[PDB]
Amino acid sequence: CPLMVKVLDAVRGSPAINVAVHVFRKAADDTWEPFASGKTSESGELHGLTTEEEFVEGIYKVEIDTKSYWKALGISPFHEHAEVVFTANDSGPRRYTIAALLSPYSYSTTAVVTN
Amino acid sequence: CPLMVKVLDAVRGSPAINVAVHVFRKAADDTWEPFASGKTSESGELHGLTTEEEFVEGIYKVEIDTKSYWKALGISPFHEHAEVVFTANDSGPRRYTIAALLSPYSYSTTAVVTNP
Amino acid sequence: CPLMVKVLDAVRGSPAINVAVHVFRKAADDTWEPFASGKTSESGELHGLTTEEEFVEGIYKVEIDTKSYWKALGISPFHEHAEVVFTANDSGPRRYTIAALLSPYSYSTTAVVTNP
Amino acid sequence: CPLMVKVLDAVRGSPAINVAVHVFRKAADDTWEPFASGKTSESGELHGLTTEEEFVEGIYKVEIDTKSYWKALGISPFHEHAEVVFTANDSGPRRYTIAALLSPYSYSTTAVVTN
Numbered sequence: 444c445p446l447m448v449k450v451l452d453a454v455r456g457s458p459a460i461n462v463a464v465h466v467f468r469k470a471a472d473d474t475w476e477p478f479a480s481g482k483t484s485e486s487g488e489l490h491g492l493t494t495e496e497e498f499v500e501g502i503y504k505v506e507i508d509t510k511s512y513w514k515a516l517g518i519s520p521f522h523e524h525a526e527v528v529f530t531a532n533d534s535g536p537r538r539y540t541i542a543a544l545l546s547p548y549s550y551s552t553t554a555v556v557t558n
Numbered sequence: 559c560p561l562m563v564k565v566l567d568a569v570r571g572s573p574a575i576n577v578a579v580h581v582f583r584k585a586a587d588d589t590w591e592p593f594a595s596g597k598t599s600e601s602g603e604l605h606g607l608t609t610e611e612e613f614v615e616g617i618y619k620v621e622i623d624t625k626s627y628w629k630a631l632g633i634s635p636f637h638e639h640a641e642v643v644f645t646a647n648d649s650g651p652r653r654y655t656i657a658a659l660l661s662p663y664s665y666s667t668t669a670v671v672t673n674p
Numbered sequence: 675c676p677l678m679v680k681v682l683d684a685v686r687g688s689p690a691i692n693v694a695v696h697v698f699r700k701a702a703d704d705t706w707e708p709f710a711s712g713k714t715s716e717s718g719e720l721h722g723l724t725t726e727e728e729f730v731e732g733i734y735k736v737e738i739d740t741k742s743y744w745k746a747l748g749i750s751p752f753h754e755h756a757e758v759v760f761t762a763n764d765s766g767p768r769r770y771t772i773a774a775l776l777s778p779y780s781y782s783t784t785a786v787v788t789n790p
Numbered sequence: 791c792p793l794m795v796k797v798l799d800a801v802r803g804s805p806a807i808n809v810a811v812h813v814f815r816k817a818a819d820d821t822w823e824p825f826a827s828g829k830t831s832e833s834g835e836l837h838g839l840t841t842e843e844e845f846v847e848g849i850y851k852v853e854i855d856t857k858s859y860w861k862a863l864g865i866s867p868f869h870e871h872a873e874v875v876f877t878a879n880d881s882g883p884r885r886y887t888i889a890a891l892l893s894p895y896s897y898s899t900t901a902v903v904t905n
């Protein structure tokens with residue numbers, strides 16, 4: 444798998460567990476088509492979203508359902524979700540990790556792309 | 559103005575100048591309708607997007623065109639754009655500052671919300 | 675003033691008010707000498723720490739007392755304090771804004787440096 | 791080992807490799823005493839700094855030598871180093887990960903503390 448998502452909680456200092464994550468691929472008509480999805484594990488990670496065969500060059504969106512995460516912890520959040528939009532490029536490293544660090548009124552996201 | 563956007567460049571330690579910003583509002587049919595747009599000034603700030611009257615309750619998306627910014631400083635960056643999606647004014651009018659801190663493979667965004 | 679500190683609270687989406695800040699400057703003997711201190715206002719900003727005359731070249735440390743801040747909002751936080759260490763004015767006078775964004779187990783800091 | 795350090799590079803979208811990291815423990819006289827050190831690996835991680843026996847409650851400082859990292863990449867940085875200061879507390883989770891995300895004029899740090 445060439446795509447992994449990792450989510451951390453800056454309030455609790457913990458992995459963000461059981462966060463829903465939806466991946467979309469941009470279609471020729473510019474709409475976002477569902478591509479893969481899952482929930483983060485006890486380590487805050489979501490593995491196995493896709494395969495090398497399927498993750499072709501294109502524009503992808505990773506939506507992390509942060510609002511539901513915070514609400515389940517009883518904490519009032521700002522954002523509806525965190526969205527990460529990027530082009531997959533075959534000239535670069537093979538493995539993409541999309542990481543996000545969550546707070547109620549702020550988030551950070553980073554891409555770690557490696558060979 | 560009840561909505562301001564501020565953008566900083568974490569490589570240079572400077573305001574991010576001339577960053578295009580597009581704001582959308584979710585319509586009754588669930589589509590993202592264009593709401594306002596502009597670009598950051600020499601201070602990295604974008605003022606005057608909207609008015610108290612116009613910025614009603616709704617779900618808003620602030621799209622910050624980071625790729626176009628970094629396609630100009632010689633950095634092929636990772637992201638297409640930073641998208642900030644939030645419900646606004648659902649407990650009455652508030653003032654929102656949407657801040658973003660940009661690097662070529664990473665960004666942070668925070669909201670500062672105040673009650674006038 | 676050539677040195678300003680701004681602090682935001684990522685839990686509340688607000689300025690971080692009444693945050694104590696201590697600035698030190700490395701002395702010739704390598705010790706950290708007290709240089710200036712203050713606390714953030716209702717805007718989350720701390721102005722007036724120093725002057726152009728006083729803020730000479732050197733290595734400075736800005737200590738932001740985050741634990742004491744969060745020991746007041748009911749959050750036992752992780753860090754003791756955020757420390758920001760940098761060489762200043764070594765190419766002539768500059769204006770420095772040291773910004774920090776606080777969560778109980780994490781913080782970000784960025785510098786915005788401008789030439790007057 | 792109860793203490794791990796992980797460092798990422800936000801400019802290159804990569805682990806931050808070969809970054810020097812120094813850990814200190816606060817002594818009774820308030821000085822910082824060297825405790826452990828190393829360099830990050832090809833994964834941006836530094837493992838094996840200490841042991842459960844040695845990492846007793848106390849105040850620790852992790853200094854990450856960011857200036858030298860950026861200079862080796864030919865990039866002009868702001869900070870001398872990034873400093874992370876915290877109390878180790880035996881009531882909490884056993885394992886501490888100190889993570890840092892580096893840019894030339896900015897850094898983020900997070901603690902992930904787990905059982």
Ligand SMILES: O=c1cc(-c2ccc(O)c(O)c2)oc2cc(O)cc(O)c12
Pocket residue numbers: 564655657658659666667668680773774775782783784896
């Ligand atoms: O979004 C961020 C916004 C700001 C910020 C900094 C100065 C301001 O006058 C302001 O209105 C916002 O500072 C940051 C500082 C950080 O270290 C990380 C961040 O994400 C931000």
Ligand SMILES: O=c1cc(-c2ccc(O)c(O)c2)oc2cc(O)cc(O)c12
Pocket residue numbers: 449451540542543544551552553780796889890891898899900
């Ligand atoms: O996105 C972030 C991701 C990570 C991160 C932390 C541990 C990992 O094993 C990893 O693969 C990524 O650490 C951060 C640490 C930060 O201080 C700020 C961030 O945005 C991140």
Ligand code: NA
Pocket residue numbers: 648649650
């Ligand atoms: Na309402």
Ligand code: NA
Pocket residue numbers: 764765766
């Ligand atoms: Na000089």
